[PDB]
Write a protein that binds this ligand. Structure first.
Ligand SMILES: *[C@@H]1O[C@H](CO)[C@@H](O[C@@H]2O[C@H](CO)[C@@H](O[C@@H]3O[C@H](CO[C@H]4O[C@H](CO)[C@@H](O)[C@H](O)[C@@H]4O)[C@@H](O)[C@H](O[C@H]4O[C@H](CO[C@H]5O[C@H](CO)[C@@H](O)[C@H](O)[C@@H]5O)[C@@H](O)[C@H](O[C@H]5O[C@H](CO)[C@@H](O)[C@H](O)[C@@H]5O)[C@@H]4O)[C@@H]3O)[C@H](O)[C@H]2NC(C)=O)[C@H](O)[C@H]1NC(C)=O
Ligand SMILES: *[C@@H]1O[C@H](CO)[C@@H](O[C@@H]2O[C@H](CO)[C@@H](O[C@@H]3O[C@H](CO[C@H]4O[C@H](CO[C@H]5O[C@H](CO)[C@@H](O)[C@H](O)[C@@H]5O)[C@@H](O)[C@H](O[C@H]5O[C@H](CO)[C@@H](O)[C@H](O)[C@@H]5O)[C@@H]4O)[C@@H](O)[C@H](O[C@H]4O[C@H](CO)[C@@H](O)[C@H](O)[C@@H]4O)[C@@H]3O)[C@H](O)[C@H]2NC(C)=O)[C@H](O)[C@H]1NC(C)=O
Lengths: 97, 49
């Protein structure tokens, strides 16, 4: 209720996967992913960290992710609703196509 | 008491860390290390033989 969590900072680290958690929403393409929160064979992971005012670090948990190369499943920045074919185009000055 | 360990040889191997256990005493620089003898996520290891 009262936000006593102001002192503790908890965030994700960088694991061994060949991508990043914050850049999965970009237009990245895969075949299957199947995230999980328990250990399974053949799967990279992102550790979790907890700290008090950036003095002493400790590891708390992890997130386990699998994947397989493909061209079927694509991430999206945010869920646009009400359309039938996701596309966008901005003209006449610099963009990132 | 009597050194019966004369036959058995036990030593460390080379793991997956990008350094060595016998050369950690040299002038090597880090930020934190925090050795442990139990499994924790995101950590290399030295086997025993
Ligand atoms: C390659 O070329 C093709 C050429 O066909 C491109 O496809 C066309 O792309 C156009 C541009 O998007 C489509 O036109 C409209 O796009 C609008 C996008 O919104 C932005 O732009 C408008 C422009 O005024 C702006 O106001 C708005 O704020 C946004 O900035 C859409 O909103 C719009 O949808 C509306 O119109 C359609 C069509 O209805 C029209 O025609 C009817 C007759 O068939 C007529 O009775 C209507 O009065 C109207 O004149 C309509 O279906 C939509 O309905 C919405 O609401 C209902 C609920 O009532 C909902 O159920 C439904 O799902 C909709 O949400 C809405 O009123 C236009 O789509 C154009 O439609 C595209 N044509 C085709 C065939 O796809 C293509 O993009 C190009 N590709 C590339 C890569 O460039
Ligand atoms: C380089 O690229 C950039 C891309 O970022 C581009 O920037 C665009 O610039 C154009 C103009 O040059 C901008 O278009 C303007 O849009 C104005 C309207 O925006 C207001 O109104 C929105 C809703 O309109 C209501 O009312 C109308 C009727 O008036 C109605 O039809 C609508 O349905 C609706 O009910 C409103 O949503 C919007 O707020 C958005 O943004 C805020 C943040 O600011 C956000 O918090 C909101 O949630 C929301 O997303 C805003 O309040 C419009 O008034 C304006 O018109 C003037 O210019 C035209 C010429 O263009 C004149 O003819 C006219 O007389 C006015 O003087 C103009 O059309 C556009 O928004 C910019 N951004 C994008 C992404 O396109 C640059 O132009 C490019 N070029 C250069 C050189 O930089």
């Amino acid at each position: 209720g009262s936000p006593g969590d102001s002192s503790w900072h908890i965030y994700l680290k960088s694991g061994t996967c060949p991508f990043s958690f914050s850049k999965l929403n970009n237009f990245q393409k895969f075949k299957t992913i199947c995230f999980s929160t328990v250990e399974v064979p053949g799967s990279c992971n992102f550790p979790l960290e907890a700290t008090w005012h950036y003095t002493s670090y400790t590891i708390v948990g992890a997130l386990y992710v699998t994947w397989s190369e493909g061209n079927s499943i694509t991430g999206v920045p945010y869920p646009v609703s009400g359309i039938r074919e996701f596309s966008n185009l901005v003209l006449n000055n610099c963009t990132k196509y």
